[PDB]
Design brief:
Chain C: Keywords: Acetylation, Cell membrane, Cytoplasmic vesicle, Hydrogen ion transport, Ion transport, Membrane, Phosphoprotein, Synapse, Transport. Chain C: It is found in: Apical cell membrane; Cytoplasmic vesicle, Secretory vesicle, Synaptic vesicle membrane; Cytoplasmic vesicle, Clathrin-coated vesicle membrane. Chain C: This is V-type proton ATPase subunit E 1. The structure is cut from a larger assembly and holds 2 copies of chain A, 1 copy of chain C, 1 copy of chain D, 1 copy of chain E, 1 copy of chain F and 1 copy of chain G. Chain A has 16 helices and 28 strands. By secondary structure, chain A is of the alpha+beta class. Chain A has 4 domains: about 70 residues, no CATH class; about 280 residues, 3-Layer(aba) Sandwich (Rossmann fold); about 70 residues, OB fold (Dihydrolipoamide Acetyltransferase, E2P) (Beta Barrel), CATH 2.40.50; about 160 residues, no CATH class. In chain A, the strands form 6 sheets. In chain A, strands 8, 18, 19, 20, 23, 24, 25, 26, 27 and 28 form a 10-stranded mixed sheet that branches. By secondary structure, chain C is an alpha+beta fold. Chain C has a domain of about 120 residues: hypothetical protein PF0899 fold (2-Layer Sandwich). Chain C has 5 helices and 4 strands; from the N terminus they run H-H-E-H-E-E-E-H-H. In chain C, strand 1, helix 3 and strand 2 form a beta-alpha-beta unit. The relative contact order of chain F is 0.06. Chain G contains 7 helices and no strands. In chain G, helix 1 crosses helix 4 and helix 5 packs across helix 7. Classes of the chains: A alpha+beta, C alpha+beta, D alpha/beta, E mainly alpha, F mainly alpha, G mainly alpha. Chains A and D meet through strand 1, helix 1, helix 4 and helix 6 of A and strand 5, strand 11, helix 6 and helix 10 of D. The complex binds adenosine-5'-diphosphate and magnesium ion. Adenosine-5'-diphosphate (ADP) binds next to helix 2 of chain B.
């Protein structure tokens, strides 16, 4: 047939006929305006199509042009600094070509420009007759000041090289490589295409074992995360990772985001900068965005995740470390519930499709550290941070999969304590993997992490009993434990996100602060315990009277600015306070 | 004249309400006042006194006409009104008159056909709008609107419709809201320039 | 002061009511002129009907245009009685162009037993063979159908463009 | 170009049920098309095609299906989707929920015809809003501040004074001084006293020449509510993005809109969401709420203030729940404050404004505004916890510090929240009423505030 | 539960009327 | 007394402005009326029959 | 929807008030003695006294040739009605024409004649009269 006809329409769902050769998840083009849709059910010579665009004004007997391919994404030069639709339409090019604030229905623009010329350099070790395989790097494009864009043979492509282009400037339409296998030939340009629903293959997945630093002390200290991690969070961190992290490339997916909040990200990110080789550069040179505001079509909302993870697997394969942020996995699960309802399926719990946990697990299990395909030996990774927006089925399904979970506390948020993460329901399962990194690079931190979690849990039981008895019965060691728990909550776990001194707290600052607070806890508790069974007995009030300057210095340790002061000064200042503490306790 | 019960009788203009509907209760009249042209609900469990408040308001209020509707409620609660209201008298020009001379009743008791409870409500409000148009101040008592909502649930159930909250049809809120919008104080149609009103006091049986 | 402020409040309300009537008077004045223009358009068309050569050139098109909406195996044309020879000629010209364009055979009949009223300016209605579907193609149908869609353009042509409308996109 | 070809008229009605009429033998049916129905008595109704299949079309009828029949009633199919006429002459006019006049003026002589669904604005072309609207209400301007171009609902319930808060915002709104709004007002399912109150207030303020009203009252047809927000917002988009006005849009009960969707969805026998609402309720509401804000290269804007009656005061109900996932905040009206004759009854704890963080502060309003808002919030949060404890243990268990928080909680509700309906407070008065409460505490308790802000503003 | 039944019944009726139309083809 | 005087003044100016506006409309109309009619009838009398684009043999 | 009415109801009420105003004018003044009021009501009294049909004044109301505001016509109508009640309740006796014109001017100037104490005084006369 090559084109069917529309038989019926009801919202974003189209039924078409003479679709006899059609396959599950083929894309089609519907109507005289050629709207994209994806096939999702077959019955004889009829197909049901989920349309990615508004169907208003579509008529019975309209054409359905039957394309041969599944939903798939253009991969190659020109992804850095791009803004994309959930379906990979280029929002900055559509704006420029149409000269208008609107998006036209059925608009067609290639996701990567064929007009721009890219500087290409081949791998120089390759010559005609060389044997090559999927994932082999065969050239480099100088896309940007930060990013050397490796050009790779597509996965499932292979053979013997018949032509390889000289160093020069080329269009994304120009043939840079040709090869042969079983007498069949392929001609290849700098751009490949991949189905977003298919995992990009690798030689080997590897254990994740290096921290993914975030600017926030709660997350770095109590609930660590790793390069190649899977994390769920409440929906601060988005800017923080982007301007300050161990990651090479950032991908942000605004899946179901509010109009004026997506507009914040799209204005804000291109203004931000980082310092590279003693020179300052925009972070937009190593970032790509997928934008999908809450009013865009429900099927594009669903695809927006698969686009962003495929773009992340593409830079993983080059041997980069990639960080992906998904702005709500709950607003994505909202789309699955709607599409499942439009298809007359039986739900499971709370109206969600019974396959929701398979859909989530298939997304999150695309994270990891890997040994890439093809000939140059590499490692790369994708780290996924998924916002959750509530007990509920989406949270319950997510906790079966993710290795780290950070939960919100409404008591902290309503007391205007930030970041408002609950340190008693949160968890991280990476700590045994990371303890060899902490053993190699810090040695002291594992005891400090352990003791801080004990103090925070011990005080949570005392905080129940003092509601009954009004504090009066409490022993001095236990008052010491209340008051130091508060020091930790207000002067370590609390962190202002906007002030320059605490915009990003490096790990040498993080270990330094906590080392002093735990050293204080030991000496203050030892003074009380050593003067039990005695005529002179030390109390928290005696320590507070004797050591008010040490409490003022301890509470002030947060103010050290890592932009103004170096490692040596910040360590020396904290070490001088440790001596001031010891001298004060020796003076008691 | 003959009028379709489902269609609102026209008026020149609806007016703000500016005068109390006195109930003769100390509570209600002091703490929680009502007006000539007002809309009231009386929710409460069995035995709280909804029908006794309805009957007391019917006997003693400052209204020119009473229309009393008993859809889906007891036959003895109708029989009490028929027994009492001929004996009880208001005073006019130094002469006493039975309050049954100012009263009409619309009965459809809890064992009469379920579908007729909808017709009781629209009959009683249409009768109330007719005397409003003469320039009278009218009160309508509807001694349980839950019995009407519960009738809609069976008819909707046998029509095999999809339910909203707790089995009720999705149109229940629109059926209630368009009934209560028939209350008010008005400039009547036509040219002798009179004004009249309907107050509605709907009991609810949760 | 309280009494003075009540006079100030009354002034605002009274002046506001004057200005609301003054706006509505100027708007009614436009729609009266537009309605008078549509009445002149109806009178201008009534001359085309008397000009029987041009009326046949319209009526040849009014029949064939109706047949292309309905696409039935059998159809019935209803017409103004005084125009019967003109529409009978128009049907005979329409049928060969209908068979050529559609590739379908057709039966087309004209009502002799019932007609459009003499009050109708002209044109036709065409019906399905059982009269459950019709297409109405009188001159008053075309005048109205075109006149409504042109309203943004007759506003601008008669009264000039709005100076505040900076963008059309 | 035009639709110059004739309109087909069908007597082929095949079923009638609730708000829906079903037709068959329809030639090449078009989804979302408009249909005009002439009844056997010559009454005219109007409707929209909700589904097409083969020769069969399902029409929702806006004015309801009473008096329709399967033989005499006929439908004319217009060939097109719903386009409303628009013009700048719509300011100072009153229309029903279908957009027909009710002020005894003429119908709109169009400057254009616009599709009531609007057209998608590119996320690249939007501007992030940073001008603060001074609403004149301290509980908003001090702790929940509104940017010009935001979407921010009022969440309320039956018996509470949300209409007075809405009217007061319309009287008092402007920019902070170291322009004035065109208003588009929509009503779904309001009673006659509510419609009279708002119309009377705009006349009492002497400003009706700058406002457009679309009214669907509780006796008007419920399916007109499906289009009423879309007529209002299509008018606001012409006024804002073609005539360069600053528009404020008020949508006065989204709960009675969401019930009209549930009727149509129930009549279609669609698969439910929570509480029987449509499974697509989020995606539908988002088409109304995301029609707001600012665009690059055009000087106008739209600010959106929806209003919700929450049923049973349940903020987790699907109507207020889904509205929070789309709009940039909420203002919450509280029965416990209303029962105590506080006005506005705004509870500052569940209230939020997500765009305030960048609209306030140095150069915008005053340099303390961020710190004072955080500290006032933390003091009220602690004071509400002390109040809840005190009712168990009695005042003999409370410390002197617990009495400082319990004193602050009274002085805050009596002076900062309580205001009265025609009082208008600047941001500066709002902040300096705020500091008179923060002075209840010694400096050492004000932990949210940095020493520079304490040093500059506490001694005064 | 009462709404997940009834939706099954309406689907069953549609499948029966569909099959009983194939008996006319 | 000033309020009572000001109302008659406002009514006078509002009336005169209403008469000016209505005068301007009738002048702009009669200057353009015939050119509009000549375009309306040019669209009405130019029939151009067409079949629906979804039609197939 | 004009006021709350259909267009047919709205224009049909206008014709009804134009007629009722004339019936009130003839029953206050059968002799054309009361020139001031017959001048102040001339714009509606022109349609009555003359020979004409309901269907003709209805076209004049749709055309806006006659007065056609029910807010203005209701105010105009009520002032004749509340004057006619006084003139009819004082059945055996007569007021002088300058006293009648004084009562008329006092009523025309009143903010809300329905809320007036004048209306209450007339209700109290009618309450005595209907018993007698
Ligand atoms: N105001 C009252 N004064 C005295 N007895 C009352 C009063 N209200 C209720 N009762 C008593 O309670 C009984 C139940 O009242 P009723 O109105 O029938 O309750 P329900 O709400 O169930 O209809 C009455 O028959 C009477 O015995
Ligand atoms: Mg009872």
């Amino acid at each position: 047939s090559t084109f069917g006809y529309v038989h019926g329409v009801s919202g974003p769902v189209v039924t078409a006929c003479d679709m006899a050769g059609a396959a599950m998840y083929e894309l089609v083009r519907v109507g005289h305006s050629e709207l994209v849709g994806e096939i999702i059910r077959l019955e004889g010579d009829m197909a049901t199509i989920q349309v990615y665009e508004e169907t208003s004004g579509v008529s019975v007997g309209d054409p359905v042009l039957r394309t041969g391919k599944p939903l798939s994404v253009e991969l190659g030069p020109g992804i850095m600094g791009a803004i994309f639709d959930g379906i990979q339409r280029p929002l900055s090019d559509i704006s420029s070509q149409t000269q208008s604030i609107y998006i036209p229905r059925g608009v067609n623009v290639s996701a990567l420009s064929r007009d721009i010329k890219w500087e290409f350099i081949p791998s120089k070790n390759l010559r005609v007759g060389s044997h090559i395989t999927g994932g082999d790097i065969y050239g480099i494009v100088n896309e940007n000041s930060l990013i050397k864009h490796k050009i790779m043979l597509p996965p499932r492509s292979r053979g013997s090289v018949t032509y390889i282009a000289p160093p020069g400037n080329y269009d994304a339409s120009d043939v840079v490589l040709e090869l042969e296998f079983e007498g069949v030939k392929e001609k290849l340009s700098m751009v490949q295409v991949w189905p977003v629903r298919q995992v990009r293959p690798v030689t080997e997945k590897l254990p994740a074992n290096h921290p993914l630093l975030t600017g926030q002390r709660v997350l770095d200290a109590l609930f660590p995360c790793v390069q190649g991690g899977t994390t769920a969070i409440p929906g601060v961190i988005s800017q923080s990772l982007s301007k300050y992290s161990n990651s090479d490339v950032i991908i942000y997916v605004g899946c179901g985001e509010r109009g004026n909040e997506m507009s914040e990200v799209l204005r804000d990110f291109p203004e931000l900068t980082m310092e590279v080789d003693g020179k300052v550069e925009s972070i937009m040179k190593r970032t790509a965005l997928v934008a999908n505001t809450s009013n865009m079509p429900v099927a594009a909302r669903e695809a927006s995740i698969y686009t962003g993870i495929t773009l992340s697997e593409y830079f993983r394969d080059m041997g980069y470390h990639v960080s992906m942020m998904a702005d709500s996995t709950s607003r994505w699960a909202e789309a699955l519930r709607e599409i499942s309802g439009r298809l007359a399926e039986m739900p499971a719990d709370s109206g969600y499709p019974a396959y929701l946990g398979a859909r989530l697990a298939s997304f999150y299990e695309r994270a990891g550290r890997v040994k890439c395909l093809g000939n140059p030996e590499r490692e790369g990774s994708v780290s996924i941070v998924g916002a959750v927006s509530p007990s509920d089925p989406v949270t319950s399904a997510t906790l079966g999969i993710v290795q780290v979970f950070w939960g919100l506390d409404k008591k902290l948020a309503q007391r205007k304590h930030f970041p408002s993460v609950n340190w008693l329901i949160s968890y991280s399962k990476y700590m045994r993997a990371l303890d060899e990194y902490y053993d190699k690079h810090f040695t002291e931190f594992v005891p400090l992490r352990t003791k801080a979690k004990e103090i925070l849990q011990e005080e949570e039981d005392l905080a129940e009993i003092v509601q009954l008895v009004g504090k009066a019965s409490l022993a001095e060691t236990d008052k010491i434990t209340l008051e130091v728990a508060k020091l930790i909550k207000d002067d370590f776990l609390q962190q202002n996100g906007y002030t320059p001194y605490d915009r990003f707290c490096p790990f040498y600052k993080t270990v330094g602060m906590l080392s002093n607070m735990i050293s204080f806890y030991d000496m203050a508790r030892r003074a009380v315990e050593t003067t039990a069974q005695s005529d002179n007995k030390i109390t928290w009030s005696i320590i507070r009277e004797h050591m008010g300057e040490i409490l003022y210095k301890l509470s002030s340790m947060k103010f050290k600015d890592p932009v103004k002061d170096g490692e040596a000064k910040i360590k020396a200042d904290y070490a001088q306070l440790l001596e001031d503490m010891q001298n004060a306790f020796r003076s008691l | 004249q003959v009028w379709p019960v489902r269609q609102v009788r026209p008026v020149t203009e609806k007016l703000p309400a500016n005068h109390p509907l006195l109930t003769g209760q100390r509570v209600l009249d002091a703490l929680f006042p009502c007006v000539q042209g007002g809309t009231t609900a009386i929710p409460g469990a069995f035995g709280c006194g909804k029908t006794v408040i309805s009957q007391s308001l019917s006997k003693y209020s400052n209204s020119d006409v009473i229309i009393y509707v008993g859809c889906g409620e007891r036959g003895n609660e109708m029989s009490e009104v028929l027994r009492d209201f001929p004996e009880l008298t208001m005073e006019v020009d130094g002469k006493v008159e039975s309050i049954m001379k100012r009263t009409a009743l619309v009965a459809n008791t809890s064992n009469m056909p379920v579908a007729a409870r909808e017709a009781s409500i629209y009959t009683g409000i249409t009768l109330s709008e007719y005397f409003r148009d003469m320039g009278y101040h009218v009160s309508m008592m509807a001694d349980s609107t839950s019995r009407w909502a519960e009738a809609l649930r069976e008819i909707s159930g046998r029509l095999a419709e999809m339910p909203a909250d707790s089995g009720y049809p999705a149109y229940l809120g629109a059926r209630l809201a368009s009934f209560y919008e028939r209350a008010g104080r008005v400039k009547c149609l036509g040219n002798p320039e009179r004004e009249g009103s309907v107050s509605i006091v709907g009991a609810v049986s949760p | 002061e309280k009494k003075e402020k009540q006079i100030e409040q009354q002034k605002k309300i009274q002046m506001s009511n004057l200005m609301n009537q003054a706006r509505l008077k100027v708007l009614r004045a436009r729609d009266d002129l537009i309605t008078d223009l549509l009445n002149e358009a109806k009178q201008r068309l009534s001359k085309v009907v008397k000009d029987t050569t041009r009326y046949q050139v319209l009526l040849d098109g009014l029949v064939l245009q109706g047949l292309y909406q309905l696409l039935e195996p059998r159809m019935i044309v209803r017409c103004r009685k005084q125009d019967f020879p003109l529409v009978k000629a128009a049907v005979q010209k329409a049928i060969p162009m209908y068979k050529i364009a559609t590739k379908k055979d057709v039966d087309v009949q004209i009502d002799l037993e019932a007609y459009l009223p003499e009050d109708i300016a002209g044109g036709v209605e065409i019906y399905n063979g059982d009269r459950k579907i019709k297409v109405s193609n009188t001159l008053e149908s075309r005048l109205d159908l075109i006149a409504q869609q042109m309203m943004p353009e007759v506003r601008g042509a008669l009264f000039g463009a709005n100076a505040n409308r900076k963008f059309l996109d | 170009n035009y639709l110059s070809q004739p309109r087909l008229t069908y007597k082929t009605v095949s079923g009638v049920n609730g708000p829906l009429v079903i037709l068959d033998h329809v030639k090449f049916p078009r989804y979302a098309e408009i249909v005009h129905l002439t009844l056997p008595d010559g009454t005219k109704r109007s409707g929209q095609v909700l589904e097409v299949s083969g020769s069969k079309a399902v029409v929702q009828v806006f004015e309801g299906t009473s008096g329709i029949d399967a033989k005499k009633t006929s439908c004319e199919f217009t060939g097109d989707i719903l386009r409303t006429p628009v013009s700048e002459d719509m300011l100072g006019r009153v229309f029903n929920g279908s957009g027909k006049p009710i002020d005894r003026g003429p119908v709109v002589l169009a400057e254009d015809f616009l599709d009531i669904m609007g057209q998608p604005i590119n996320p690249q072309c939007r501007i992030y809003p940073e001008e603060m609207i001074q609403t004149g209400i301290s509980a908003i301007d001090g702790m929940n501040s509104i940017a010009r171009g935001q979407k921010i609902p009022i969440f309320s319930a039956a018996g509470l004074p949300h209409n007075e808060i809405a009217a007061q915002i319309c009287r008092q709104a402007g920019l902070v001084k170291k322009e004035n709004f065109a208003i588009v007002f929509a009503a779904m399912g309001v009673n006659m006293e509510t419609a009279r109150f708002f119309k009377s207030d705009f006349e009492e303020n002497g400003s009706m020449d700058n406002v457009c009203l679309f009214l669907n009252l509780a006796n008007d047809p419920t399916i007109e509510r499906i289009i009423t927000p879309r007529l209002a917002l299509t008018t606001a988009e012409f006024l804002a993005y073609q005539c360069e006005k600053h528009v404020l849009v008020i949508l006065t009960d989204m709960s009675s809109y969401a019930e009209a969707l549930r009727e149509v969805s129930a009549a279609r026998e669609e698969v439910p969401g929570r509480r029987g609402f449509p499974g697509y309720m989020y995606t539908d509401l988002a088409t109304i709420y995301e029609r707001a804000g600012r665009v690059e290269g055009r000087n106008g804007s739209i600010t959106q203030i929806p209003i919700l009656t929450m049923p049973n005061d349940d903020i987790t109900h699907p109507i207020p729940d889904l509205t929070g996932y789309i709009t940039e905040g909420q203002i919450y009206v509280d029965r416990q404050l209303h029962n105590r004759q506080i006005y506005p009854p705004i509870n500052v704890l569940p209230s939020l404004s997500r765009l305030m963080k960048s609209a306030i502060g140095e150069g915008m309003t005053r340099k303390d505004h961020a710190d004072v808002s955080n500290q006032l919030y933390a003091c009220y949060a602690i004071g509400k916890d002390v109040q809840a404890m005190k009712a168990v243990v009695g005042e003999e268990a409370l410390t002197s510090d617990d009495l400082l928080y319990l004193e602050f909680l009274q002085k805050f509700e009596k002076n900062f929240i309580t205001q009265g309906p025609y009082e208008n407070r600047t941001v500066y008065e709002t902040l300096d009423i705020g500091w008179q409460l923060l002075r209840i505490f010694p400096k050492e308790m004000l932990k949210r505030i940095p020493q520079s802000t304490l040093s500059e503003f506490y001694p005064r | 539960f009462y709404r997940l039944k009834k939706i099954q019944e309406k689907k069953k009726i549609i499948k029966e009327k569909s099959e009983k139309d194939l008996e006319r083809r | 007394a000033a309020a009572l005087g000001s109302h008659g003044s406002c009514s006078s100016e509002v009336e005169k402005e209403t008469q000016e506006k209505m005068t301007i409309l009738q002048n702009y109309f009669e200057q353009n009326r015939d050119e509009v009619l000549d375009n309306l009838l040019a669209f009405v009398c130019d029939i151009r029959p067409e079949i629906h684009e979804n039609y197939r043999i | 929807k004009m006021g709350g009415l259909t267009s047919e109801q709205y224009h049909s009420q206008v014709v009804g008030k134009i007629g009722y105003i004339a019936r009130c004018m003839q029953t206050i003044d059968p002799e054309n003695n009361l020139k001031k009021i017959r001048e102040d009501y001339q714009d509606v009294l022109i349609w009555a006294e003359k020979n004409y049909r309901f269907e003709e004044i209805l076209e004049a109301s749709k055309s806006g040739k006659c007065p056609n505001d029910l807010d203005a016509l209701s105010r105009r109508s009520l002032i004749l009605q509340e004057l006619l009640r006084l003139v009819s309740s004082i059945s055996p006796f007569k007021m002088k024409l300058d006293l009648i014109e004084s009562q008329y001017e006092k009523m025309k100037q009143h903010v809300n004649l329905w809320k007036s104490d004048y209306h209450v005084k007339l209700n109290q006369l009618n309450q005595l009269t209907d018993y007698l």
